[PDB]
Amino acid sequence: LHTQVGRGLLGAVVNPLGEVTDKFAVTDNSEILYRPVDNAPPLYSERAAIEKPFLTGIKVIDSLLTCGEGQRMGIFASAGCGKTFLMNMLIEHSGADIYVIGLIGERGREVTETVDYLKNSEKKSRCVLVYATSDYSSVDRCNAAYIATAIAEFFRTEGHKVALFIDSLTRYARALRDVALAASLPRLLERPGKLKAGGSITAFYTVLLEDDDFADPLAEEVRSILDGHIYLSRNLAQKGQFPAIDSLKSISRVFTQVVDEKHRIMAAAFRELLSEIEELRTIIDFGEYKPGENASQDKIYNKISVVESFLKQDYRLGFTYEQTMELIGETIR
C-alpha cells in the first residue's frame, strides 16, 4: 500500500485511500510523489539524541514540560477537557516547518471543525490533514494513521522540522482490534524522531480517558511507550483553568536534556510551589486555614493568584521562551 506524499499536499485534506478530497489552502507547489505507508522505524544508529527544545508557545509546557525535537508526547484527556483546543494551540503557537494531522475520529462534524480551523489558521499553507470517520471501515481508520505518518516521514527526509498529530490513538487501537478480528503499535509510535541525516518528526498522540480521568489498559501501555505525557484534568477544566493541564501529573522525559541549568532550577522551584499550593488547598477545604496563624501558609495563599495567572493562557496567545521564563521567574519571587 502506497500513498501520495510531497509539497503538493500542503493545504490538502486526504482521505483513508490517500486521495485529496478537499483543500483548506492552495500553494504554488505541485510536487506529488509516492511512498509506501508501511516503513520500518529508523535504526538506532540513524537516530539523533533528543537535545533541542521543540517550543510550543504554551507557558506551562515550555516551562515545566519542555518538549524536544523528535519526541513522542501523549495527550491524555476525558471528553470535554479541551484536547482539540490544546492541539490547535500546539499547531498555532509552535514553530514547526510542517504540520501533519491525522484524525481517526468518528463523526464528520469533527473533521469539518478541524478543516474550518485550518481554513482560518496562519499555518494553513504548511499543514496536511488526513482523516477517517466512523463511516469508514476499521482498515481505513488504521490506514489514516499510517498515511499521516508516511507524509510526515517524507517531509522529514527533506530536512523539515515536522509536527505530527494523531487524534486519537484510542480510536486507532479500537479499529486495530476490529481489524485483528478479521484476521501492531509501537511500530507506529516508533516512527517519529530526529534523524542524523534528516529533519525530525515530533509527534503528539491523543488518548481518551473513559469515565473520570482513568487510564484503561491502553492508556497505561501508551504512557509506557512514549517520551512523556500531558494530562488534561476535567477537574481543572470545571474550575475554569484553560489549558486544563495538570502539570504535577504530567512529564516530559527529555526535559533535563533540552533545557539549561537555570531553567531546571526555576522549574523545580515552581513545581515545589505548586505542590505547596495543592496542600494548602486541601487544608482550606478541611476548614483548617486561618489567616495570620502560620506565616508560611499565608505566603503560599498569597501566591495562588499569580500562579494561576501564569498557568492560564488565552488560546489565541503564544509566548516566546524568553517571555515564559521571565514570567515564571516573576511568579516564584
Coordinates of C-alpha atoms in Angstrom, one line a residue:
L1 CA 0.0 0.0 0.0
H2 CA 1.4 3.4 -1.2
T3 CA 0.2 6.9 -0.7
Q4 CA 0.8 10.4 -2.2
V5 CA 3.5 12.5 -0.5
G6 CA 5.2 15.8 -1.2
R7 CA 4.8 19.5 -1.0
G8 CA 1.8 19.4 -3.4
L9 CA -0.2 18.0 -0.4
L10 CA 0.3 21.2 1.7
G11 CA -3.1 22.7 2.2
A12 CA -4.9 19.4 1.3
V13 CA -7.4 17.2 3.1
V14 CA -6.6 13.5 2.4
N15 CA -9.0 10.5 2.9
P16 CA -8.1 7.0 4.0
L17 CA -7.5 5.9 0.4
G18 CA -4.8 8.6 0.1
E19 CA -6.8 10.8 -2.3
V20 CA -7.3 14.6 -1.9
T21 CA -10.9 15.4 -1.2
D22 CA -10.8 19.0 0.0
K23 CA -8.4 21.9 0.4
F24 CA -8.0 24.5 3.2
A25 CA -5.2 26.3 1.4
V26 CA -3.7 26.4 -2.1
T27 CA 0.0 26.7 -2.7
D28 CA 2.2 27.2 -5.8
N29 CA 3.9 23.8 -5.3
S30 CA 2.5 20.8 -7.2
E31 CA 5.1 18.1 -6.2
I32 CA 3.4 14.7 -5.9
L33 CA 5.4 11.6 -5.3
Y34 CA 4.5 8.1 -4.0
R35 CA 5.8 6.2 -0.9
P36 CA 4.7 3.1 1.0
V37 CA 2.6 3.6 4.1
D38 CA 4.4 0.8 5.9
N39 CA 8.0 1.6 6.6
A40 CA 10.5 0.3 9.3
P41 CA 11.5 2.6 12.0
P42 CA 15.0 4.2 11.9
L43 CA 17.9 2.1 13.1
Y44 CA 19.3 3.2 16.5
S45 CA 22.4 4.5 14.7
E46 CA 20.4 6.7 12.4
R47 CA 18.5 8.5 15.2
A48 CA 19.9 11.6 16.8
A49 CA 19.6 12.1 20.5
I50 CA 16.8 14.5 21.6
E51 CA 18.6 17.6 22.7
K52 CA 16.9 20.6 21.1
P53 CA 13.7 22.0 22.5
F54 CA 10.5 21.9 20.4
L55 CA 8.9 25.1 21.7
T56 CA 5.1 25.2 21.8
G57 CA 4.3 28.8 22.8
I58 CA 2.3 27.5 25.8
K59 CA 3.7 28.8 29.1
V60 CA 3.1 25.7 31.3
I61 CA 4.5 23.3 28.6
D62 CA 7.6 25.3 27.6
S63 CA 8.5 25.9 31.3
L64 CA 7.6 22.7 33.1
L65 CA 7.0 20.0 30.3
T66 CA 9.5 21.1 27.7
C67 CA 9.3 19.1 24.6
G68 CA 12.3 18.1 22.4
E69 CA 12.5 17.9 18.6
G70 CA 11.9 14.2 17.7
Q71 CA 10.0 13.4 20.9
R72 CA 6.7 11.5 21.2
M73 CA 4.3 13.0 23.7
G74 CA 1.0 11.7 24.8
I75 CA -2.0 13.9 25.5
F76 CA -4.4 12.3 27.9
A77 CA -7.9 13.7 28.5
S78 CA -11.6 12.8 29.1
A79 CA -14.2 14.2 26.7
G80 CA -14.7 17.9 27.1
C81 CA -11.2 18.6 28.6
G82 CA -10.1 20.9 25.7
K83 CA -8.0 18.4 23.8
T84 CA -8.8 19.8 20.4
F85 CA -8.2 23.3 21.5
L86 CA -4.9 22.2 23.0
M87 CA -3.9 20.7 19.7
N88 CA -5.0 23.9 17.9
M89 CA -2.7 25.9 20.3
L90 CA 0.2 23.4 19.7
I91 CA -0.1 24.0 15.9
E92 CA -0.7 27.7 16.1
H93 CA 2.0 28.8 18.7
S94 CA 4.8 26.3 17.9
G95 CA 7.4 26.8 15.2
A96 CA 7.4 23.6 13.1
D97 CA 8.1 23.8 9.3
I98 CA 5.2 21.5 8.5
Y99 CA 2.2 20.1 10.5
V100 CA 0.6 16.8 9.6
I101 CA -2.7 16.0 11.4
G102 CA -4.2 12.5 11.4
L103 CA -7.8 12.5 12.6
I104 CA -9.1 9.0 13.4
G105 CA -12.4 10.4 14.7
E106 CA -15.9 9.2 14.2
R107 CA -18.3 12.0 13.1
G108 CA -17.7 14.1 10.0
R109 CA -18.5 17.3 12.0
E110 CA -15.3 16.9 14.0
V111 CA -13.3 16.7 10.7
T112 CA -15.2 19.7 9.3
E113 CA -14.4 21.6 12.6
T114 CA -10.7 20.9 12.0
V115 CA -10.9 21.9 8.4
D116 CA -12.6 25.2 9.3
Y117 CA -9.9 25.9 11.9
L118 CA -7.2 25.2 9.3
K119 CA -9.0 27.4 6.8
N120 CA -8.6 30.3 9.2
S121 CA -5.1 29.4 10.5
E122 CA -1.9 31.3 9.9
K123 CA -0.3 27.9 9.4
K124 CA -2.7 26.7 6.7
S125 CA -0.1 26.8 3.9
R126 CA 2.1 24.4 5.9
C127 CA -0.5 21.8 7.1
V128 CA -1.7 18.5 5.7
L129 CA -4.9 16.8 7.1
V130 CA -5.6 13.1 6.8
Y131 CA -8.9 11.8 8.1
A132 CA -11.1 8.8 8.7
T133 CA -14.6 9.0 10.2
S134 CA -16.9 6.2 11.6
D135 CA -18.3 5.8 8.1
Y136 CA -15.0 4.2 7.1
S137 CA -14.0 0.6 7.8
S138 CA -11.5 -0.3 10.5
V139 CA -8.9 -1.0 7.8
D140 CA -9.4 2.6 6.5
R141 CA -9.2 4.0 10.1
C142 CA -5.8 2.4 10.7
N143 CA -4.5 3.3 7.3
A144 CA -5.3 7.0 8.0
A145 CA -2.7 6.9 10.8
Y146 CA -0.2 5.2 8.5
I147 CA -0.8 7.7 5.7
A148 CA -0.4 10.7 8.1
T149 CA 2.9 9.2 9.4
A150 CA 4.3 8.4 5.8
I151 CA 3.5 12.0 4.7
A152 CA 5.4 13.3 7.8
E153 CA 8.3 10.9 7.0
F154 CA 8.7 12.3 3.5
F155 CA 9.0 15.9 4.8
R156 CA 11.5 14.6 7.5
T157 CA 13.7 13.1 4.8
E158 CA 13.7 16.5 3.0
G159 CA 15.1 18.1 6.1
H160 CA 12.0 19.7 7.6
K161 CA 11.0 20.1 11.2
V162 CA 7.6 18.3 11.2
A163 CA 5.0 18.1 13.9
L164 CA 2.7 15.1 13.6
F165 CA -0.6 14.8 15.5
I166 CA -2.6 11.5 15.8
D167 CA -6.1 12.1 17.3
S168 CA -6.8 9.6 18.6
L169 CA -4.6 6.6 19.5
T170 CA -7.7 5.3 21.3
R171 CA -9.8 5.0 18.1
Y172 CA -6.8 3.8 16.1
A173 CA -6.4 1.0 18.7
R174 CA -10.1 0.2 18.6
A175 CA -10.0 -0.1 14.8
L176 CA -6.9 -2.1 15.0
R177 CA -8.7 -4.5 17.4
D178 CA -11.6 -4.8 15.0
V179 CA -9.2 -5.5 12.1
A180 CA -7.5 -8.2 14.2
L181 CA -10.9 -9.9 14.5
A182 CA -11.0 -10.1 10.6
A183 CA -7.7 -12.0 10.7
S184 CA 1.0 -3.5 15.7
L185 CA 2.0 -0.3 17.6
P186 CA 4.5 0.6 18.9
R187 CA 5.6 0.1 15.3
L188 CA 3.5 3.2 14.5
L189 CA 4.7 5.1 17.6
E190 CA 8.4 4.4 17.0
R191 CA 8.4 6.1 13.5
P192 CA 8.8 9.7 14.8
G193 CA 12.2 11.1 15.9
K194 CA 15.0 13.2 14.7
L195 CA 17.3 11.6 12.1
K196 CA 21.0 12.2 11.9
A197 CA 20.7 12.6 8.1
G198 CA 17.4 14.4 8.0
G199 CA 14.9 16.6 9.9
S200 CA 12.6 15.5 12.7
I201 CA 9.1 14.4 13.5
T202 CA 7.9 15.5 16.9
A203 CA 4.6 13.6 17.5
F204 CA 1.6 14.2 19.7
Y205 CA -0.8 11.2 20.3
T206 CA -4.1 11.8 22.0
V207 CA -5.6 9.1 24.3
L208 CA -9.2 9.3 25.6
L209 CA -9.7 8.7 29.3
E210 CA -13.0 6.9 29.9
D211 CA -15.4 7.8 32.8
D212 CA -13.3 10.1 35.0
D213 CA -9.6 10.7 34.2
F214 CA -9.0 7.0 34.5
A215 CA -6.3 5.1 32.4
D216 CA -7.7 1.9 30.8
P217 CA -5.1 -0.7 29.8
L218 CA -4.4 1.1 26.5
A219 CA -3.6 4.3 28.3
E220 CA -1.1 2.6 30.6
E221 CA 0.6 0.9 27.6
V222 CA 0.7 4.1 25.6
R223 CA 2.2 6.0 28.6
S224 CA 4.9 3.4 28.9
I225 CA 5.8 3.6 25.2
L226 CA 6.0 7.4 24.8
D227 CA 8.6 10.0 25.9
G228 CA 6.1 11.8 28.2
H229 CA 2.5 12.7 28.7
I230 CA 0.4 15.8 29.2
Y231 CA -2.7 15.1 31.4
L232 CA -5.7 17.3 30.9
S233 CA -7.8 17.4 34.2
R234 CA -11.6 17.5 33.9
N235 CA -11.5 18.9 37.5
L236 CA -9.2 21.8 36.4
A237 CA -11.5 22.4 33.3
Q238 CA -14.6 22.8 35.5
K239 CA -12.7 25.2 37.7
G240 CA -12.1 27.3 34.6
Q241 CA -8.4 26.8 34.1
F242 CA -7.5 26.6 30.4
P243 CA -5.4 24.9 29.3
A244 CA -6.5 22.3 31.8
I245 CA -3.0 20.8 32.1
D246 CA -2.2 19.2 35.4
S247 CA 1.5 19.8 35.4
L248 CA 2.0 17.7 38.6
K249 CA 0.7 14.6 36.8
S250 CA 2.4 15.4 33.5
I251 CA 6.0 14.8 32.5
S252 CA 8.4 15.3 29.6
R253 CA 11.0 12.6 29.9
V254 CA 13.5 14.6 27.9
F255 CA 13.1 17.7 30.0
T256 CA 16.5 17.8 31.6
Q257 CA 18.2 17.1 28.2
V258 CA 16.6 20.1 26.4
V259 CA 16.8 23.0 28.9
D260 CA 19.7 24.6 30.7
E261 CA 20.5 24.6 34.4
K262 CA 19.0 28.0 35.3
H263 CA 15.7 26.8 33.7
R264 CA 15.9 23.5 35.6
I265 CA 16.3 25.4 38.9
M266 CA 13.3 27.7 38.1
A267 CA 11.1 24.8 37.1
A268 CA 11.9 22.8 40.2
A269 CA 11.2 25.8 42.4
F270 CA 7.9 26.4 40.6
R271 CA 6.8 22.7 41.0
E272 CA 7.6 22.9 44.7
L273 CA 5.3 26.0 44.9
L274 CA 2.5 24.1 43.0
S275 CA 2.8 21.2 45.5
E276 CA 2.6 23.6 48.4
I277 CA -0.5 25.3 46.9
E278 CA -2.2 21.9 46.5
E279 CA -1.6 21.0 50.1
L280 CA -2.9 24.4 51.2
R281 CA -6.0 23.9 49.1
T282 CA -6.7 20.7 51.0
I283 CA -6.1 22.5 54.3
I284 CA -8.6 25.2 53.2
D285 CA -11.2 22.5 52.3
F286 CA -10.6 21.0 55.7
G287 CA -11.5 24.3 57.4
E288 CA -8.1 24.4 59.0
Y289 CA -6.8 27.6 57.3
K290 CA -6.9 30.8 59.5
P291 CA -5.1 33.9 58.2
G292 CA -2.2 35.0 60.4
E293 CA -1.8 31.7 62.3
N294 CA 1.1 30.4 60.1
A295 CA 3.2 32.9 58.1
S296 CA 4.4 30.2 55.6
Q297 CA 0.8 29.2 54.8
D298 CA -0.2 32.9 54.3
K299 CA 2.8 33.4 51.9
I300 CA 1.6 30.4 49.9
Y301 CA -2.0 31.7 50.0
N302 CA -0.9 35.0 48.6
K303 CA 0.9 33.2 45.7
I304 CA -2.2 31.4 44.4
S305 CA -3.4 34.2 42.1
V306 CA -0.1 34.8 40.5
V307 CA 0.5 31.1 40.0
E308 CA -3.0 30.6 38.4
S309 CA -2.3 33.6 36.1
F310 CA 1.0 32.0 34.9
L311 CA -0.7 28.7 34.2
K312 CA -3.8 30.2 32.4
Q313 CA -3.4 31.0 28.7
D314 CA -5.8 32.5 26.2
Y315 CA -5.8 30.1 23.3
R316 CA -5.1 32.9 20.8
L317 CA -1.9 34.0 22.6
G318 CA 1.5 32.4 22.2
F319 CA 4.6 33.2 24.4
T320 CA 8.3 33.2 23.4
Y321 CA 10.7 31.2 25.5
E322 CA 12.2 34.4 26.9
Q323 CA 8.7 35.7 27.9
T324 CA 7.8 32.4 29.6
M325 CA 11.0 32.2 31.6
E326 CA 10.6 35.9 32.6
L327 CA 7.0 35.2 33.8
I328 CA 7.9 32.1 35.7
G329 CA 10.7 33.9 37.4
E330 CA 8.3 36.7 38.5
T331 CA 5.9 34.0 39.8
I332 CA 8.5 32.3 42.1
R333 CA 9.8 35.6 43.6

